[PDB]
């Protein structure tokens, strides 16, 4: 068995083909097992209808999830990615750094 704590990166991207659009991304990488719960949060609120949940694995024991959705970040909301994983005794909330 192997278990690997997801690395969690939360960042915003504009698709270059629609630069007006802003995507909050939670890139959850290198985890094993694949079982995971990943949410994007707006304050503590899970963002529903996260448009993209792209799971892949490299090695059979390394999973990568890009979990991202269009969002419109404003000051009034903190955005975060919340990951639960067996390796994470508590949900890991990685705040979107507004500069990221």
Number of strands: 8
* CATH hierarchy: architecture: Sandwich
What is the strand arrangement across the widest sheet?
1-2-6-5
Largest sheet entry? 4 strands, antiparallel
The CATH H-level superfamily is Immunoglobulins
Helix and strand succession?
A: EEEEEEEE
- Count of alpha/pi helices: 0
Strand content: over 45%
Structural class: mainly beta
Q: Can you tell me the number of structural domains?
A: 1
Question: Could you tell me the radius of gyration in angstroms?
Answer: 13 Å
Specify the helix fraction band: under 10%
Indicate the overall shape. globular
Give the class-level CATH name.
Mainly Beta
User: Terminal Cα separation, in Å?
Assistant: 34 Å
Multimeric status of the protein: monomer
- In CATH, the topology is named Immunoglobulin-like
List the helices and strands and how they pair.
Blueprint: E1 7-13, E2 22-31, E3 37-42, E4 45-46, E5 52-57, E6 63-71, E7 79-84, E8 92-95
Antiparallel strand pairs: 1-2, 2-6, 3-4, 3-7, 5-6, 7-8
GO cellular component, one term: HFE-transferrin receptor complex
Modified residues (Pyrrolidone carboxylic acid): 3
Glycosylation sites: 2, 20, 42, 49, 59, 92, 95
In words, what does this structure look like?
The protein has 100 residues and is mainly β. The chain has one domain (7-95): Immunoglobulins (Immunoglobulin-like). The protein has no helices and 8 strands. Strand 7 and strand 8 form a beta hairpin. It is globular. It starts with 6 loop residues before the first strand and ends in a 5-residue tail after the last strand. It is classed as immune system.
């Amino acid at each position: 068995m192997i278990q690997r704590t997801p690395k969690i990166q939360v960042y915003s991207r504009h698709p270059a083909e629609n630069g007006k659009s802003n995507f909050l991304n939670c890139y959850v990488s290198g985890f094993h097992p694949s079982d995971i719960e990943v949410d994007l949060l707006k304050n503590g609120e899970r963002i529903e209808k996260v448009e993209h949940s792209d799971l892949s694995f490299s090695k059979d024991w390394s999973f990568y999830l890009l979990y991202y959705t269009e969002f419109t970040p404003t000051e009034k909301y903190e955005y975060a990615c919340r990951v639960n994983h067996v390796t994470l005794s508590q949900p890991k909330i990685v705040k979107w750094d507004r500069d990221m």
